[PDB]
Design a binder for this molecule. Structure first.
Ligand SMILES: Nc1ncnc2c1ncn2[C@@H]1O[C@H](COP(=O)(O)OP(=O)(O)O)[C@@H](O)[C@H]1O
Ligand SMILES: Nc1ncnc2c1ncn2[C@@H]1O[C@H](COP(=O)(O)OP(=O)(O)O)[C@@H](O)[C@H]1O
Ligand SMILES: Nc1ncnc2c1ncn2[C@@H]1O[C@H](COP(=O)(O)OP(=O)(O)O)[C@@H](O)[C@H]1O
Ligand SMILES: Nc1ncnc2c1ncn2[C@@H]1O[C@H](COP(=O)(O)OP(=O)(O)O)[C@@H](O)[C@H]1O
Ligand SMILES: Nc1ncnc2c1ncn2[C@@H]1O[C@H](COP(=O)(O)OP(=O)(O)O)[C@@H](O)[C@H]1O
Ligand SMILES: Nc1ncnc2c1ncn2[C@@H]1O[C@H](COP(=O)(O)OP(=O)(O)O)[C@@H](O)[C@H]1O
Ligand SMILES: O=P(O)(O)OC[C@H]1O[C@](O)(COP(=O)(O)O)[C@@H](O)[C@@H]1O
Ligand SMILES: O=P(O)(O)OC[C@H]1O[C@](O)(COP(=O)(O)O)[C@@H](O)[C@@H]1O
Ligand SMILES: O=P(O)(O)OC[C@H]1O[C@](O)(COP(=O)(O)O)[C@@H](O)[C@@H]1O
Ligand SMILES: O=P(O)(O)OC[C@H]1O[C@](O)(CO)[C@@H](O)[C@@H]1O
Ligand SMILES: O=P(O)(O)OC[C@H]1O[C@](O)(CO)[C@@H](O)[C@@H]1O
Lengths: 741, 741, 111
């Protein structure tokens, strides 16, 4: 489908994840049939030419998808800014016949790339004038197409909600924070942390929100005058009220109202002078620029490389330079120039002290996250003292994140003045009582623990419905906020159709989807999915290393997730599995013969290794032992085979940054939705919830949050397979089969 | 065997692992029958008394073993130095009736504790004089017993090799270094790393050796005059000779000949001024003082905690205060004072600029490590250019550490002027040729990658022995260094036994044991065991968190190890398993019934979970599915059960600190012994090696390195099951059982 | 099998590695096939045999029988064949497995 050549480079500040993007672009460029060239040392080697530019084969980008940084340098060039460097680079490209380029880096690198594009024609004219090239060559390569990628941990590119590599940087910052928090709680010492980021406070805020830090500094919202006294009051209140440790996070470019940078040494001197608490400071440095890339990072980096290659092949000279970014939950494509000038407009906005205008220009999500952070950071004295009574339940299997969500919900409810109860062991608990009131201090520190300390059970409510109604009437509970998996959705549904028989079930209930399988309808991601994918990715990478150690071997892996195939597909994408067998993609024996022939052919190459996943219930009869026997027999003399079953190790340890933050966001928003619905449905001195809109599942759709009624989702659920009728992630399977030979 | 009370506390700089120490002490104290109290906030709460000291049950120390820092505070006290605070603490202890006390922390805390033992009688006299206590109480508590545990990552304590937590600090350091190396290679940047260690460079030395850094600065061997020229020469040589990045490590106590501190800022200014290379400086901060402790930290803390309990209960008043330390791989016991003055004298000698005397006082092991690091850091110009040739093999299952040993052996061999070959695919390749010489630069970066790059196979030599001898004669090989598992030892044994039938096999053969199962005879640790222990440690902790998520659950985990239960036993100790089944400990059905009823007893308590480790072939009929059926049957109505198989995940990813160091040290010392014997047996112009001492297995014995003849080990090897007759780790099974109820 | 129409049986006869017993009993009972060590077979032969069963199930004789010596192949277990025949034969017939164990040693000796 193509007959032209491709060039690729990464430039600017390295962010872990470029390796997956460069792998994807080169592998599609080969798969589509185009020629691909790797530019070493970035713009330095592009200008130098010669050995700095070289053709690559299908195997050139192997054994890098799990590696941070980049294999091709991405060094900063000075001659590129000059006319002589640009014409030399154009001379090198025409000598190698490069007409489409992919660039990875920051805003300046792409600005320079588009500057190079805007005068490519002029460069060809004077290059012909000096006699270096013939006019026929200039006519052949008369146009240059640019596709851009944003690789930077700062996440300052306002046109993209998530830049490549930030999730991995979020993993590195938080594991450092977790190590620091242990000694901080031990010694009762207040600490100041310095996170990376040129002039952006996204990383500082996300880390503080995911760690419950007692105070934050960001450039987007500089502190108001007299912040010293408010700092002293808050830290005194925290350490007095049982908070053993205090965490302070400061972006390297944090400023005051006058824009003057606030040095961490000043903050340390102030806290020591005014409180005398023992304290330290730890500058983290370049730790955010390294480590293994996150599974979401690898998936997104590969997907952006997929779209960049497609954009380059389908672009025209009249088409302006374009970048691929994220809007909602799809790979959108935006013009480079418009994002550049809007970023510069936000930059002058924060420079010109019009901080609010910079805030609205960049976006409205992070100001709301900052509002949630200030709400939950400290106990604001509640005044409402509303008669509403709420209960929180854990249902389903254990998963990463429910702890943060319940912590968010209880603290928000106490802030709202409601009486909050917490039920242990879910519906089985409610039948057997086991209900206690909770306080603000009673939930501290839950943000950093995986699983659910409250516990969960697979019991459904209809078996003990009478005891549930009795306990509801005894304790006067007026709302439910179940956080759990598919079984939570089933239980809430059964309660909904039970409303006609039992009048007390005319109550408001909401479900927070939390399960590793990601099979709860009404959402596009379930809380705890990302932790499970990260665990499976690490484990499969370790299996890949073991297989590569003993060459000519293949591994069978049995990933969990019931009938849903999301976990299998994302793991296979992250670790480059040669195939992923899934229930939604039926396959017969001839397909396995084809895959066996693929592996036998690949065994002739230098990369003599293989890894094929299998969702645990992808096929009724073709169990994992089937695949082991078939591969071992048909591959006799060529390779051997082994089996693995990733057990409950896929349920993860410490939760991930996105899961912690997403659980806190859903807990707050669900509590606001409850308080809303309760204050409408209260009439004549009693709560009466009969409309189906009183039973909804809070979830993040393609763009933002929604509240779909549970009964409305009944027409979109396969209760036999316990998974929704249609799922959005089926597109990624084409990508998974693409990235393998 | 006790009718008294035990007290525990932690003081000084927190070093992650005190949770394991207090767990083992508390659980051993309860098992022996002595009451146990947890003294919070260290010596501050000790003097304060009251609520700061409270009794602990078996469940008081549950679910803390995997936590960094400490759960009992460890605050610093000032009145503890004053006699008023001392008498107040003594009053608190006699009021709670505690006669024995276990101290955890650094040297100063031990000095204070010995002062307490030295004046306990005077304090009780003062309390009786003022009327606080009766005469009978004074007679009852007339003596105090002190047992000290050296918990400090600095590893300054002279009489001990490993203090509690130093391995965890090395784990933190190397996680950070592996993160940094990606971006440092990407941007071609030099990084100056500041390491902790109050006045010792052990952590700096071990990190530099395990990272292959370009230059090191420690206090034990301060740099000679004009060292800056050597800095410029080495850094220019590395950057010119293919070294993409440069790493410089500095101890926080680094000094010059005059003892003046060397600032990392100075080193950055010097390298920038004299070379202009882009560079950075990173300070790890207090990240090393927290985080989840590594597996070696937990096992070491548990053994020292048990030994401290034993020491306290077997002590007498005439006996002086003693501690528990490491000699070889056993818990030896030393007197407190002698080590204290030895450490003080070493510090004084370092301050007095007698740096040679300080080096001799630390121990010859450090000096040998310094010499090994100097030998391997840069390529010294060889001059001998002998006629000898060498071949290196990888055999057995791939184990994390083979690459480090191969790199060290190759570079040491190049230094001695021998031509060294590397045979891919083990003995199979040696029959199939594939033998290639290797240069210095050809093995760069192997230290930091797991697996086996040469490739390993389980094939044995006797099947292709004619082709083996043909290739030996063609390449003129004069010795083999076969690093590998039991298959390596068996293959070299076959070649030695075949020396009678052919002449060419009269050739010196050295074996480096490298296998996760730790079954090669003649050694105590096999290269790569520690990585597998740690990998299984994380896996089991993740399973236990999932288990606690679903209250009332038990897990059956099947771990590798061939027949040796070393891996299963140490992992079970690492994660507090209820029982670990192993071939070396025969078990019938009655023991399983006994374990089940014990599990039901535990399930009546608050901690409603469980875990059992099964070696992969601990029993020929009782497979893991049998155990699942038995447990799910006899626990019906009380709990459920699950099974997980840690397959090739137990081979681990990046090797841990000890495995990199152990691989490097074995590679150097094995190559030196090989060159020594090869020069010994060369006579009249032809090599001829017939005596049994010409074939040995390098291994770390109880104390230090020794070369055991390969044939002599035959009488201490079980070729039926592939493991030695006797193993040293059988004592650890007693710890595993006693620490569980 | 003939009683419950549309059914196939995988019979794992004894005999060690020798397939004399599996062959001759297959002739004596008209089995559809008798997999034996002396005749190595791959997945293609099993696919063909499934295809013969698929065609044969359209006729009046809606039954089948395939033998297998107990150790006729290292990997293709009787469970593997049961899964293969049931899966690729979905919608037309079902399958069951049997193991003629020490019944093969027989009762009273024949004349
Ligand atoms: N305005 C520009 N015009 C031409 N080239 C540019 C421009 N800005 C950046 N570049 C090129 O990209 C390289 C990196 O730029 P830098 O400011 O360091 O970070 P980034 O490009 O990621 O924003 C520069 O060395 C230069 O070669
Ligand atoms: N946890 C926090 N982190 C950072 N800034 C905070 C935090 N809490 C409050 N602030 C800021 O300090 C000021 C006082 O807090 P605020 O929420 O306004 O309380 P009040 O309603 O009494 O004025 C505000 O400007 C707020 O933005
Ligand atoms: N690690 C991740 N895993 C899955 N999805 C993610 C991840 N990070 C970001 N996203 C998606 O991109 C969005 C970025 O989140 P953000 O803009 O910070 O605010 P919010 O999540 O509240 O919308 C997320 O909402 C999510 O849809
Ligand atoms: N020789 C001593 N006599 C009395 N108290 C001491 C002595 N040494 C230390 N202490 C006290 O015990 C604690 C441990 O001392 P510190 O210097 O903080 O760390 P470390 O002793 O582990 O090196 C401190 O609170 C100290 O005041
Ligand atoms: N790779 C290195 N890392 C750290 N220090 C080094 C290194 N190489 C040399 N030095 C320091 O410079 C000194 C000179 O090295 P040395 O082994 O004495 O070489 P030579 O004796 O042949 O001149 C060493 O004693 C050491 O202190
Ligand atoms: N992580 C570990 N695992 C197993 N044993 C260890 C570990 N760390 C230390 N040891 C034991 O203490 C010794 C530490 O050796 P060290 O003091 O660094 O000098 P050297 O390696 O030259 O002998 C090791 O040989 C080993 O016996
Ligand atoms: O993913 P679901 O269907 O909500 O069920 C949750 C659990 O069920 C499992 O199958 C395992 O169940 P258990 O952990 O209870 O044994 C996993 O897919 C998952 O951890
Ligand atoms: O058995 P050895 O040679 O002592 O080495 C241990 C290896 O053997 C194993 O059992 C590997 O088994 P495989 O034959 O399937 O590779 C693991 O315990 C481990 O990887
Ligand atoms: O068949 P062989 O190998 O000649 O040995 C005789 C017996 O061995 C068998 O395999 C039966 O094995 P077992 O009686 O030990 O279970 C049959 O072939 C036969 O009944
Ligand atoms: O040492 P470096 O790489 O120049 O880091 C400084 C710059 O790196 C960045 O993180 C680039 O993303 C910026 O925040 C910062 O200005
Ligand atoms: O909080 P502290 O006691 O000052 O600890 C920092 C100093 O002690 C150490 O932690 C020793 O372990 C060093 O890292 C440092 O010199």
């Amino acid at each position: 489908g193509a007959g032209k050549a491709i060039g690729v480079l990464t430039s600017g500040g390295d962010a872990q994840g470029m390796n997956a993007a460069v792998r994807a672009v080169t592998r599609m460029g080969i798969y589509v049939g185009a020629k691909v060239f790797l530019i070493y040392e970035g713009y330095e080697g592009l200008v130098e030419g010669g050995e700095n530019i070289k053709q690559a084969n299908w195997l050139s980008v192997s054994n890098i998808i799990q590696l941070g940084g980049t294999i091709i340098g991405s060094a900063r060039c000075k001659a590129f800014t000059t006319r002589e460097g640009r014409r030399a680079a154009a001379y090198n490209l025409v000598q190698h016949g490069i007409t489409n380029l992919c660039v990875i880096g920051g805003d300046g690198s792409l600005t320079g790339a588009n500057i190079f594009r805007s005068e490519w024609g002029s460069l060809l004219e004077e290059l012909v004038a000096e006699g270096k090239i013939s006019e026929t060559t200039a006519r052949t390569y008369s146009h240059l197409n640019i596709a851009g990628l944003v690789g930077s941990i700062d996440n300052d590119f306002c046109g993209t909600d998530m830049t490549i590599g930030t999730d991995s940087a979020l993993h590195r910052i938080m594991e450092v924070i977790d190590a620091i928090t242990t000694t901080a709680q031990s010694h009762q010492r207040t600490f100041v942390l310095e996170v990376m980021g040129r002039h952006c406070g996204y990383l500082a805020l996300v880390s503080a929100l995911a760690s419950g830090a007692d105070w934050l500094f960001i450039p987007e919202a500089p502190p108001e005058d007299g912040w010293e006294n408010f700092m002293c009051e808050r830290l005194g209140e925290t350490r007095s009220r049982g908070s053993r440790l205090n965490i302070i996070i400061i972006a390297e470019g944090a400023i005051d109202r006058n824009g003057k940078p606030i040095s961490s040494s000043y903050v340390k001197d102030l806290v020591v002078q005014r409180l005398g608490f023992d304290t330290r400071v730890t500058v983290l440095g370049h730790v955010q620029r390294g480590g293994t890339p996150s599974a979401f990072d690898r998936i997104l980096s590969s997907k952006m490389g997929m779209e960049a290659v497609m954009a380059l092949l389908e672009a025209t000279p009249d088409t302006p330079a374009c970048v691929v970014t994220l809007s909602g939950n799809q790979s959108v494509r935006l013009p480079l120039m418009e994002c550049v000038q809007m970023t510069k407009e936000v930059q002058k906005a924060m420079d010109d002290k019009r901080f609010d205008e910079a805030t609205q220009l960049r976006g409205g999500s992070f100001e709301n996250n900052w509002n949630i952070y200030k709400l939950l950071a400290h106990q604001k004295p509640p005044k409402e003292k509303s008669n509403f009574s709420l209960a929180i339940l854990n249902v389903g299997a254990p998963a990463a994140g429910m702890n943060a969500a319940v912590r968010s919900a209880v603290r928000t409810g106490i802030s709202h003045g409601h009486t909050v109860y917490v039920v242990h062991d879910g519906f089985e608990g409610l039948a057997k009582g086991q209900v206690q009131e909770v306080g603000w201090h009673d939930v501290a520190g839950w943000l950093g623990r995986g699983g659910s300390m409250l516990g969960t059970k697979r019991t459904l409510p209809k078996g003990q419905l009478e005891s549930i109604v009795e306990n509801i009437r005894i304790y006067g509970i007026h709302a439910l906020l179940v956080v759990g998996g598919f079984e939570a959705y089933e239980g809430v549904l059964q309660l909904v159709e039970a409303r006609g028989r039992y009048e007390e079930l005319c109550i408001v209930m909401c479900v927070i989807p939390a399960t590793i399988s990601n099979n709860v309808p009404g959402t596009d991601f379930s809380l705890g999915s990302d932790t499970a994918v990260n665990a499976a990715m690490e484990s499969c990478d370790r299996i890949k290393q073991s297989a590569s150690g003993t060459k000519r071997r293949v591994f069978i892996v049995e990933t969990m997730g019931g009938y849903c195939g999301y976990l299998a597909t994302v793991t296979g994408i992250a670790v480059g599995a040669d195939a992923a067998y899934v229930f939604e993609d039926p396959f017969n024996i001839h397909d396995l013969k084809v895959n066996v022939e693929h592996m036998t052919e690949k065994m002739k190459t230098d990369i003599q290794r293989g890894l094929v996943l299998r969702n645990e219930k992808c096929h009724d009869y073709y169990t994992t032992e089937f695949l082991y026997n078939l591969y071992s027999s048909e591959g006799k003399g060529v390779f051997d085979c082994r089996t693995n079953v990733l057990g409950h190790l896929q349920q993860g340890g410490a939760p991930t940054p996105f899961d912690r933050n997403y659980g806190t966001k859903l807990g707050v928003k669900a509590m606001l939705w409850l308080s809303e619905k309760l204050r409408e449905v209260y009439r004549k001195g009693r709560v009466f919830a009969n409309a189906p809109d009183s039973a909804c599942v809070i979830g993040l759709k393609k763009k933002a949050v929604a509240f779909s009624p549970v009964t409305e989702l009944k027409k979109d659920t396969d209760f036999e397979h316990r998974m929704p009728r249609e799922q959005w992630w089926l597109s990624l399977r084409l990508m998974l089969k693409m990235l393998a030979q």
